[PDB]
């Protein structure tokens, strides 16, 4: 058996084919086993519609999730990524930095 803690990155991107739109991303990488819970939060509340959830795995057994959705942020709300996994004794909450 092997278990590996997920790396968690939270960042924003504009797709080049539609640059006025902005997307909040959570890249959860390198984890094992694949069982996992991942949500985007706004002011601490789950974002219910997340348009994209893409899972893959590498040669060593090691899973990768890109979890993302269109959003329109502004100086007001706080956004974060919440992850729970067997390797994490508490849910990990990673805040979105608006410069990322």
Author numbering: 0 to 99
From the paper:
A recent case of systemic amyloidosis involves the highly unstable D76N mutation of beta-2 microglobulin (β2m). The D76N mutant is strongly amyloidogenic and, in contrast to the wt protein, aggregates efficiently and abundantly without seeding and under native conditions. Indeed, the 76 position is located in a solvent exposed loop between β-strands E and F. A detailed analysis of the interaction energies of the ensembles reveals that D76 is at the center of a network of stabilizing electrostatic interactions that are lost in the D76N mutant.
To strengthen this hypothesis, four mutations were inserted at position 76: D76A, D76E, D76H, and D76K. While D76K resulted too unstable to be purified, the other three variants were structurally and biophysically characterized. The crystal structures of D76A, D76E, and D76H were determined to high resolution. Analogously to the structure of D76N2, these structures do not show any major conformational change compared to wt β2m. However, although the backbone of the EF loop is well superimposable between the structures of wt β2m and the mutants, changing the residue in position 76 alters the H-bond network within the loop, in particular in D76A and D76E. In keeping with this observation, the D76A structure where Ala76 side chain cannot establish any H-bond with neighboring residues, displays an electron density for the EF loop poorer than those of all other structures indicating an increased disorder. The side chain of Arg97 presents different conformations, and the strength of its interactions with the EF loop and to Trp95 varies in different mutants; residue Met99 interacts with Ser11 or with Arg12. Such observations suggest a role for residue 76 in determining the interactions within the EF loop and with β2m C-terminal region. Similarly to the D76N mutant, all three mutants display a decreased stability and increased aggregation propensity, confirming the key role played by position 76 in determining β2m biophysical properties. A saturation site mutagenesis (D76 to E, H, and A) allowed us to show here how position 76 is indeed crucial in the β2m fold, any mutation at this position results in a notable decrease in thermal stability and a remarkable increase in aggregation propensity as observed for D76N. Intriguingly, the crystal structures suggest that D76 is an important node in a network of H-bond within the EF loop.
